[PDB]
Design a protein around this nucleic acid. Structure first.
Ligand code: ZN
Lengths: 114, 56, 207, 122, 124
RNA sequence: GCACCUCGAUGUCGGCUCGUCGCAUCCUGGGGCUGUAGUCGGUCCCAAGGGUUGGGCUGUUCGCCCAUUAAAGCGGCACGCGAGCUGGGUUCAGAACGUCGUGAGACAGUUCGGUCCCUAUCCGUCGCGGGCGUUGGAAAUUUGAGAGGAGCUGUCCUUAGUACGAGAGGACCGGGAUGGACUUACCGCUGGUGUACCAGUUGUUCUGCCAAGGGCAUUGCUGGGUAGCUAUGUAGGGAAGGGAUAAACGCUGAAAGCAUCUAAGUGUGAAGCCCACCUCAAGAUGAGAUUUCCCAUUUCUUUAAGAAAGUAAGACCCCUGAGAGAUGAUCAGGUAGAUAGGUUGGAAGUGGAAGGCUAGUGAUAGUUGGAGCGGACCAAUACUAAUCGGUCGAGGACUUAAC
RNA sequence: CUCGUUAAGGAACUCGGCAAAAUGACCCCGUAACUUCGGGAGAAGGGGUGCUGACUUCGGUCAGCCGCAGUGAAUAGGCCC
């Protein structure tokens, strides 16, 4: 463990804001359309986070044009530029897998100040 | 499946050559001399490792 | 040519310059020492005997100390021979360190696979099952043993038995990074063996 | 992964609703299809009126599966549906409207007429 | 962690009984597999008896058997100690200044009806 | 066709599982002829290395159909394989239809139903140990006589809209990219599981009651999940070459002033053959090689490759174990000590403990506080257990030659 | 052998959905062809269900609270042409 952490230490990002599963987030991804570079945005609710080290990932749920979409990211990629927390949610567990079988108003998460 | 031929005396006894008993590590007690199993309490006097153990 | 002995630490991840994610395997190799040089006049062929991983001294005996004495090292745990390397260029006492390789350097990697015990023909050989319903009594068995005419079973009829524990080499892997002050090589992909097991790394045969 | 006798919704304006897969073209014993792969299928449910009528053998390309795709930078995408678009043998939609969102892999496989009409391209 | 010939709830019953003995008796004869599993469980109880607080008491009370007494005590009454009360008043303060390792095992002999290897596990 | 063989018993077809062999070759490789312009083809010769698909209908082989493929070969092996599976079909006892018979009953006509036993002695096949040998006793590193695995193939881009051809159409020979099926490892990622991990919740019973918990109800049920084992996940592979050849094609050349690949001489030439790549291997009784370690008591049968005794180098018994494992073996250690338990910090994981406080008529909520708990994972630490001991194990033959 | 769970697909399995999985309690709404007028009928298809307070004409209804889930365990029709 400590030989691996030392090698991988110099590649962890330091500008990562704190968030939990349940919060809403805007990810500033990076797309390459031929030679062009460009930035998209992907707005949704964080539903997963499974971790320990450079190997940390999270996933975001969204509903686009009547179909639900999920996108998982590593925490430390340089191919993301920004993670912004928009709201805070009141939640009671770590994996919000029950959201993937609800729609509209049943899938509502209450807000909370922090 | 059933034995097609009976087995003779030589082949029975050649099977039975790895069918014995062993009497492994036996030492002498340090306190009372008599033989005892190593890493065990001595059954004759209740001493293990120079002290008394099966007493109060 | 180039070749070193080391031990297996584990697997991790890494991002590249362009920003791709790549799985990797850390191998640790403290300096190897050349203990003996084999030639055609003495031995009949050409090779080099290398040692790795220092050993406490209650754990060796007198013949081993005598063999390691002409090279001025501590007794070693792992001793291998490295062939097809222009001798010259080498002498008893020398140290081979990880900066023998650089990033790039397509390489071969060998080890001994993990042990798994007594296993059946389905896990051991990739054989398929029989049906699980429809009156069946033939789930997890090795098949028919052959035809009637030769009055016997042929060889290489495959069955149950002890699985794993053999040596395996994997060809054409890449060195992603070399770190000298720590004696570490990063190799792209997965390697055979368990953790703390001996690993050998040579430059590749197919070039 | 989509195999023989899987059922897909249609994300097109062609007159088909449900489709049943018959083959996974490309290879000789290939099992499964993915996002950007071509298929031979039966129309199982049509719409009253429409260029395409039920009982027809036709070709379609997969967008939008549940077990989705993986990208080189370590990130993934997954959808809640399986969907396809009926195709005209040189990759053009036989309809004029794509519904719902579409995976970005359809660019690399060169369905450029379809990436023009999708509402969102992820 | 050694299945001991039992299902999951019978193993737990058996361990909960053998560690409440040895709290009450301080010296016991058992087989050799049970004794190892029990060294682990009993020392986990003693480091809660040394912690001392209410949360530790209620943590131990999920594992120590209840309607068992351990009495060598009478000033003038029938005053009973409860084998959890002994854990918290007697055995914790005893091993105050010792770090782990509150037990020890000795090997004796195989049982007559079994040839099961037997063992004595005691405290100090 | 015959009736040698088996009547004190030799169990039929398709399917399943597991294959192996022949070549009269289905694809891929190499060629000669064409009524071969190119692109596709016809036919004959050499070639068995590898490959040769999923459904619908019938008990069904056979067959027809659908959608693909480089291709969807034909035979032998008790028409391979029931002490390995199935029992749909044929061929027991019940019942019915057409039909024959006065009748009892009958039909390679049909219909619905209908009992498949076996604890492996020997040889054989897959794995794993003990004994002795290899001529002093030991610890390691190895050469390779032999042997086994592997061996498939598509599409696009370029050469080039070039050669060819009225047009339509469209190459050889080279170079580059990316796939299908098959296979060797592995758990960082995406998932599966995870019965001594965390949480929620129903019924009833116990810890005297309240609060807080234990037992049982499929692990009571429900939501997650560490290590380990895993594919549908991730990495790699069948790369390029050399040698001798098959069909075929020569160069030089006479018998036979010419001609002629052949007799003397001299070449080219295939996915095939021997190497090249991977793994096993000196019980290869032809038992191979290199480096290092250890060096002499007592009586005589008679002095002899004699017996017996204590030892060296080294090994084992016995104990703690796991990266190993059915057992035994293998590997890590035995106080010259981190081998396993415990302890002290940490991590994954769960998701906000108990006891108080505050706001509510209450159910509950907020707060002290990312709290408490935490199997297998990571560091340190001799606190408990690896104590004390015993057993085995050399003294090196003879002949010839050179030094 | 007897049990528990399983990504994506969902009868592609086999003589045949064999064996499993799914439905299952109570209250309310609704319910076709056909018919010997009794039936068909639990046809099919849908909704409610915990806890606290107030009112309760009576049977219930309103306000509030908590969880992924309220016949929170065990027991109990699959249906159609
Ligand atoms: Zn004694």
């Amino acid at each position: 463990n400590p030989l691996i952490q030392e090698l991988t230490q110099e590649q962890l990002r330091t500008d990562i804001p704190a968030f939990r599963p349940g919060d809403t987030v805007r990810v500033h991804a990076k797309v390459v359309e031929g030679t062009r570079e460009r930035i998209q945005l992907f707005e949704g609710v964080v539903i997963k986070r499974r971790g320990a080290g450079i190997s940390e990932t999270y996933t975001v749920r969204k509903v686009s044009n009547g179909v639900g979409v999920e996108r998982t990211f590593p925490l430390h990629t340089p191919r993301v530029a920004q993670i912004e927390v928009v709201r805070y949610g009141k939640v009671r567990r770590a994996k919000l897998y029950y959201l993937r079988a609800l729609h509209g108003k049943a899938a509502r998460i209450k807000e909370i100040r922090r | 499946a059933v034995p097609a031929r009976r087995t003779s005396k030589a082949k029975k006894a050649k099977r039975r050559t790895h069918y014995k008993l062993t009497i492994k590590g036996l030492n002498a007690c340090s306190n009372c001399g008599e033989m005892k199993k190593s890493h065990h309490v001595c059954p004759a006097c209740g001493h293990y490792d120079g002290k008394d153990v099966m007493s109060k | 040519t180039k070749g070193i002995l080391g031990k297996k630490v584990g697997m991790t991840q890494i991002f590249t310059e362009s920003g791709e994610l790549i799985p990797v395997t850390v191998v640790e190799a403290t300096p190897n020492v050349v203990l003996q040089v084999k030639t055609v006049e003495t031995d009949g062929y050409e090779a080099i005997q290398v040692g790795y991983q220092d050993k406490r001294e209650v754990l060796s005996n007198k013949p081993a100390k005598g063999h390691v004495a002409k090279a001025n090292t501590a007794p070693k745990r792992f001793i291998k021979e490295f062939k097809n390397v222009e001798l010259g260029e080498y002498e008893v006492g020398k140290e081979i360190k990880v900066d023998v390789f650089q990033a790039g350097d397509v390489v071969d990697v060998t080890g001994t696979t993990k042990g798994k015990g007594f296993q059946g023909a389905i896990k051991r050989h990739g054989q398929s099952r029989g049906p699980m319903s429809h009156g069946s009594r033939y789930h997890r068995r090795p098949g028919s043993m052959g035809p009637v005419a030769p009055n016997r079973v042929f060889k290489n009829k495959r069955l149950a038995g002890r699985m794993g524990g053999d040596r395996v080499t994997i060809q054409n892997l890449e060195v992603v990074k070399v770190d000298v002050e720590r004696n570490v090589i990063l190799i792209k992909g997965n390697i055979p063996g368990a953790k703390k097991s001996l690993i050998t790394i040579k430059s590749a045969v197919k070039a | 992964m989509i195999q023989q006798e899987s059922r897909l919704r249609v994300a097109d304006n062609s007159g088909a609703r449900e489709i049943l897969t018959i083959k996974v073209l490309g290879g000789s014993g290939r099992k499964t299809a993915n996002i950007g792969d071509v298929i031979v299928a039966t129309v199982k449910q049509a719409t009253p009126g429409g260029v395409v009528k039920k009982g027809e053998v036709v070709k379609a390309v997969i967008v939008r599966t549940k077990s989705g795709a993986r990208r080189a930078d370590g990130s993934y995408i997954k959808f809640d549906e399986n969907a396809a678009v009926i195709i005209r043998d040189d990759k053009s939609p036989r309809g004029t409207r794509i519904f719902g969102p579409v995976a970005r892999e359809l660019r690399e496989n060169n369905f450029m007429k379809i990436v023009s009409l999708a509402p969102e391209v992820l | 962690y050694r299945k001991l010939g039992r299902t999951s709830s019978q193993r737990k019953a058996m361990l909960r009984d053998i560690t409440t003995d040895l709290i009450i008796n301080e010296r016991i004869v058992t087989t050799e597999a049970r004794a190892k599993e029990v060294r682990s469980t009993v020392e986990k109880m003693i480091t809660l008896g040394k912690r001392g607080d209410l949360h530790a008491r209620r943590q131990a009370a999920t594992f120590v058997r209840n309607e068992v007494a351990s009495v060598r005590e009478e000033d003038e009454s029938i005053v009973v100690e409860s084998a959890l009360q002994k854990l918290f008043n007697d055995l914790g303060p005893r091993f105050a200044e010792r770090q782990g390792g509150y037990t020890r095992i000795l090997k004796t002999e195989p049982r007559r009806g079994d040839a099961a290897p037997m063992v004595v596990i005691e405290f100090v």
